[PDB]
Design a protein around this ligand. Structure first.
Ligand SMILES: CC(C)C[C@H](NC(=O)[C@@H](O)[C@H](N)Cc1ccccc1)C(=O)O
Ligand SMILES: Oc1ccc2[nH]ccc2c1
Ligand SMILES: [Yb+3]
Ligand SMILES: [Yb+3]
Ligand SMILES: [Yb+3]
Ligand SMILES: [Zn+2]
Length: 607
């Protein structure tokens, strides 16, 4: 049972297909049209069904050419309102019918951000983008909003003719709109069954550039050249991912670089991965995000978590594959460096929540919990740590990668639970069941806090980061003179970031130390978003008033939640910037992404 959904479950009925015909109205900030759901009964004598909705206006529901009765239940907070539909004729098991729902979204749809022209790069045209994961698809259209159900889809999207629509699907042509010659209709087809959280739409002044045999990059004109360079490794990553996972079944792998308010680093929308423009470091150093979203084309989009309680299945396996891709590209020592880094991030998350908090469990219970509030590095890094620990237990990376590929083949096009995964693990490693029985399954899967065992990590690339961080932490005033730009000589951007992560873990440092760090390393000059983020956090937590405007600027000029939330939170905790932090939020709130606005508000204890 999916406790995040109010819809009929898959054991009652199953959506097979969605045909979406809609029009994007920028003047009203609404999407209007029809969602035609092909639904298969899973029960004898089925006379009604229930769908998820959130802030949707329902005009009518049509079956067999006639309007039918429906009722909207009372709103249940972030879950929205259940929509019960009375079928005109009782259905037998496996019978399929088509239900056409006429609907309109609210301008406040939590799935959508509507951008004015001034919020874009080009400054002439408006822009719209969606983000459905986890449970926001219901805020665009009525559906069984649960990843336990998979469906194909086709869509026709009417937009002002100067603009371009793209979706998580294969592009299927464009025409003038016969009802309004100021508009164009873009058509789309997704022929691989997907969970509805993978439905995506963007509308804006988009151009494209080819960067590989199956990849275009899309953005506004002013970002195209930079993005084409930044993500030039994409095809080589796809080839490695195919070796690890089996065939790529989705046809195209395009990339869309969003405006700065995109709340995530990446989102694995099928055929069209969405990325933050904060990846545009100029040197490809943040390309692990591409490798990660590529990997979801197997772990997530083919084998899918059955409910959000089992989210770690999606993210843990994907981080595991991500790090393997990067390991092939740049070496096994680099894979170990990033694995160790991720353990550090797990340390941070556990410290933040508290070692007994329910959100530090690998498998969670999301009953009455908004997924956006529970979201953290835990499913990512506790999940990766489990897989990395099992890798080392069961005989190494090539043995465990054999399992991963067999796992993907086994559960392709299905939605599964932790027990399904574990059962298959035991089946596959039939001859190592005694080794498997040494794992403390109850602790790993269901207990809060750090995992019961830390895996073994090569320290080669990490040693210099730790060494330099320790020099700074143990330095006294009379030691500050010895630090010099040459300290950074042999460190990669990845190592500089890790040096800062190590140091941030022991923050605050004395203000004089941080002032010296800027004097000799000039971190204010670095544009790499990950580095700048940790440096600004270090400054604010160490009470450097000079860093206040810098932190405010970064918190607001982009909206990746990873950066925006902790920067606002740090700014709120520093007495000198507290009032500015709350004021800046209040002034920006209306033009923020709805999810980001909500979470920053909660973080700051405002509204
Ligand atoms: C390299 C990755 C760790 C990057 C990470 N992105 C992801 O994990 C994406 O695949 C996730 N699909 C992001 C997500 C998770 C849950 C709800 C909405 C969106 C991110 O930070 O955005
Ligand atoms: O967005 C999500 C989805 C599933 C989850 N499980 C735990 C946190 C979480 C967040
Ligand atoms: Yb076609
Ligand atoms: Yb001294
Ligand atoms: Yb208030
Ligand atoms: Zn992911």
């Amino acid at each position: 049972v999916d406790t995040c959904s109010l819809a009929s479950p898959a054991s009652v009925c199953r959506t097979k297909h969605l045909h979406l015909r809609c029009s994007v109205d920028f003047t009203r900030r609404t999407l209007t049209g029809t969602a035609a759901l092909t639904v298969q009964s899973q029960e004898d004598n089925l006379r009604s069904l229930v769908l998820d909705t959130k802030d949707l206006t329902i005009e009518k529901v049509v079956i067999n050419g006639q309007e039918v009765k429906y009722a909207l239940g009372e709103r249940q907070s972030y879950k929205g309102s259940p929509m019960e539909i009375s079928l005109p004729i009782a259905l037998s098991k496996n019978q399929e019918i088509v239900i056409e729902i006429s609907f309109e979204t609210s301008p406040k749809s939590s799935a959508l951000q509507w951008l004015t022209p001034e919020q874009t790069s080009g400054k002439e045209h408006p822009y719209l983008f969606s983000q459905c994961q986890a449970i926001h698809c219901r805020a665009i259209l009525p559906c069984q909003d649960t990843p336990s159900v998979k469906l194909t889809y086709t869509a026709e999207v009417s937009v002002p003719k100067e603009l371009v629509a793209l979706m998580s699907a294969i592009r299927d042509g464009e025409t003038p709109d016969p009802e309004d010659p100021s508009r164009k209709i873009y058509k789309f087809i997704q022929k691989v069954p997907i969970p509805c959280y993978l439905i995506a739409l963007v509308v804006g002044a988009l151009e494209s550039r080819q960067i590989g045999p199956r990849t275009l990059v899309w953005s506004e004109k002013e970002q195209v050249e930079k993005s084409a360079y930044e993500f030039s490794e994409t095809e080589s990553m796809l080839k490695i991912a195919e070796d690890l996972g089996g065939p790529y079944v989705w046809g195209q792998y395009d990339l869309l670089v969003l405006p700065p308010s995109f709340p995530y680093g990446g989102m694995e929308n099928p055929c069209l991965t969405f990325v933050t423009p904060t990846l545009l470091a100029g040197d490809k150093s943040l390309s692990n995000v591409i490798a990660h979203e590529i990997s979801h084309s197997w772990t997530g989009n083919l084998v899918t978590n059955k409910t959000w309680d089992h989210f770690w299945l999606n993210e843990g396996h994907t981080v595991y594959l991500e790090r393997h891709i990067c390991g092939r590209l740049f070496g096994e020592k680099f894979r170990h460096f990033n694995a160790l880094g991720g353990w550090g991030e797990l340390q941070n998350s556990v410290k933040t929540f508290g070692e007994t908090h329910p959100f530090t469990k690998l498998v969670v219970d999301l009953t009455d919990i908004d997924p956006d509030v529970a979201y953290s590095s835990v499913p990512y890094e506790k999940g990766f740590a489990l897989l990395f620990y099992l890798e080392q237990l069961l005989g190494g990376p090539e043995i465990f990668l054999g399992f991963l590929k067999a796992y993907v083949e086994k559960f392709s096009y299905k939605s599964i639970t932790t027990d399904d995964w574990k059962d298959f693990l035991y089946s596959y490693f039939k001859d190592k069941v005694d080794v498997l029985n040494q794992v403390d399954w109850n602790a790993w899967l269901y207990s809060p806090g750090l995992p019961p065992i830390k895996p073994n990590y090569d320290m080669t690339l990490t040693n210099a980061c730790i060494a330099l961080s320790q020099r700074w932490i143990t330095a006294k005033e009379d030691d500050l003179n010895s630090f010099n730009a040459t300290d950074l000589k042999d460190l990669s951007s990845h190592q500089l970031n890790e040096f800062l992560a190590q140091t941030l873990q022991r923050a605050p440092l004395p203000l004089g130390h941080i002032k010296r760090m800027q004097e000799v390393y000039n971190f204010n000059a670095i544009n790499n978003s990950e580095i700048r983020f940790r440096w600004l956090r270090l400054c604010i937590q160490s009470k450097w008033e000079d860093a206040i405007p810098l932190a405010l600027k970064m918190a607001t000029e982009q909206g990746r939640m990873k950066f925006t939330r902790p920067l606002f939170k740090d700014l709120a905790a520093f007495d000198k910037s507290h009032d500015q932090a709350v004021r800046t939020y209040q002034e920006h709130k209306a033009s923020m992404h709805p999810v980001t606005a909500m979470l920053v508000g909660k973080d700051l204890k405002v509204d």
